[PDB]
Amino acid sequence: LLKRDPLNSMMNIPAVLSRFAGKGLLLSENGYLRWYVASMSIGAVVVLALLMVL
């Protein structure tokens, strides 16, 4: 049961999480300019809202 080294896979879990998160985040770099301007506007709204709530 232990010959697969379960603790090694348990500690390799965050490497899989990092790979999945990086592959998910790379989908945002589609290369479209209008999406880039929309994302800049989204970030401006987000930072302004965070400044208003505090």
Binding site: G22, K23, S28, W35, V37, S39, M40, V46, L48
Partner: protein, 467 residues
């Protein structure tokens, strides 16, 4: 208040760069000679670099309602001048293969260096805005220099539209701030204040949006891999080094000299932006097969580390020297890496197993890849150690945890590139040799100041502005 001759003595790099801009213009108009205008640009940049000594012998003075000159401005002026000199040195062998005119490149580089110097000396909102635009516009020219190539035109259009939008955002936030306070000076933001008022906070948020675009900060970071890949390699070198150095220097000047830096909400949103920038920039470069996009995400992560060093400026007094040391190390490492990329891309026509045909460039590239990872015996480790010490001193535990995680991810992809340099793959002109010497001295400086960092600490701490 009027202009004294001592003010022009302190104004030596700006006047020298403007004079050599005019001289390069007139020499281009007289005759299209690549070597003559290139030598003129290098001579002017070196003249500004050695006039920094006379600026230091003059002293620190508030030369304009706009400008203030001290060791801070001196250090950042020297950094952007070194970046511009390396950009010209890498650009000349690349420009040897350009079928079109090769003379406007050095003019645009000199004008962008002038904008960087004016950003380093900025103590006014108007100077800050003008320096940002004077960095951006020659970068619009240089990014789309090879407009026959598709990707350069793509990066030029994207950078121009996005930077015009960010300039509009920054200018609107500037106008809201000026409506709140009534003075555009860097020391009179909120002097009439109850430091939290929504109009000033919104104006500073919009300037944060603009500067975070200019510093490749999340979520205004999506342009960085595209613009870095599309642009020519010396242009990528300049955009990675000089623009980031100058804009972060003026950001630190704004956040140090203003009383608005004591506000908790701006510090909280800057911590959020720094966390997101580090994690996103490190995670996005995991599966990158292209070196330019990988270095763009690297720039995002390193600017996140600089953000972490900047957030704790109000609490500790050692944050500014940490940013100076990190920016010196980052400048040298980016110069070496992008110089190896540029020398591999020169001359312009239109890295696996690099050691077996170009061993010295492979050595420089793997040294700079070790340096960018924060590994000891290199300068990037000294910068990361300074950032971690600054974060620990002001008790920013989420930020230092993000720094550790991002450093591990950067370790993975940087060392992957480093071993790929030494696997098995399936010039002859003194300008190329000069570029090789430049990247070799960059690697040697990184190694020597990683082993023995104390002289760099002494030079950085001696660059002390008005507290």
């Amino acid at each position: 208040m009027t202009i004294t001759p001592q003010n022009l003595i302190a104004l030596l790099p700006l006047l020298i760069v403007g004079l050599t801009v005019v001289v390069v213009m007139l020499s281009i108009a007289w005759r299209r000679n690549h070597f003559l205008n290139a030598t003129l640009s290098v001579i002017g940049l070196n003249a500004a670099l050695v006039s920094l000594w006379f600026v230091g012998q003059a002293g620190a003075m508030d030369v304009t309602p706009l400008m203030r000159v001290d060791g801070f401005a001196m250090l950042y002026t020297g950094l952007v001048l070194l970046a511009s000199l390396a950009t010209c040195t890498f650009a000349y062998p690349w420009l040897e293969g350009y079928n079109d005119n090769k003379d406007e490149f050095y003019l645009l580089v000199l004008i962008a260096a002038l904008g960087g110097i004016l950003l380093a000396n900025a103590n006014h909102l108007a100077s800050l805005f003008l320096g940002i635009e004077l960095i951006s516009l020659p970068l619009f020219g240089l990014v789309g220099y090879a407009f026959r190539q598709k990707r350069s035109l793509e990066a030029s259009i994207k950078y121009t539209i996005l930077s015009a939008a960010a300039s509009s955002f920054l200018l609107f936030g500037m106008a809201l701030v000026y409506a709140q306070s009534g003075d555009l000076s860097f020391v009179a933001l909120g002097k009439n204040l109850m430091l939290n008022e929504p109009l000033l906070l919104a104006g500073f948020g919009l300037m944060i949006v603009g500067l975070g675009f200019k510093l490749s900060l999340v979520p205004f970071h999506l342009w960085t891999p595209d613009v870095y890949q599309g642009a020519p390699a010396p242009v990528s070198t300049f955009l990675a080094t000089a623009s980031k150095i100058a804009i972060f220097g003026v950001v630190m000047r704004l956040f140090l000299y203003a009383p608005v830096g004591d506000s908790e909400a701006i510090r909280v949103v800057l911590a959020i932006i720094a966390f997101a920038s580090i994690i996103f920039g490190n995670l996005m470069a995991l599966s990158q097969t292209n070196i330019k996009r990988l270095l763009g995400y690297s720039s995002i992560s390193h600017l996140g580390y600089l953000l972490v060093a900047l957030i704790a400026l109000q609490t500790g007094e050692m944050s500014m020297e940490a940013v100076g040391v990190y920016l010196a190390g980052y400048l040298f490492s980016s110069l070496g890496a992008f110089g190896v990329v540029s020398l591999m891309s020169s001359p312009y026509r239109g890295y696996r197993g690099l050691f077996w045909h170009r061993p010295i460039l492979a050595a420089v590239m793997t040294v700079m890849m070790l340096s960018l990872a924060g590994i000891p015996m290199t300068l990037g480790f000294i910068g990361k150690f300074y950032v971690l010490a600054v974060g620990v001193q002001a008790h920013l535990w989420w930020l230092v945890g993000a720094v550790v995680v991002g450093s591990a991810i950067g370790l993975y992809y940087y060392l992957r590139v480093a071993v790929s340099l030494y696997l098995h793959a399936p010039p002859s002109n003194w300008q190329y040799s000069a570029g090789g010497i430049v990247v070799l001295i960059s690697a040697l400086l990184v190694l020597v100041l990683g082993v023995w960092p104390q002289p760099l600490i002494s030079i950085v701490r001696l660059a002390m502005p008005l507290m």
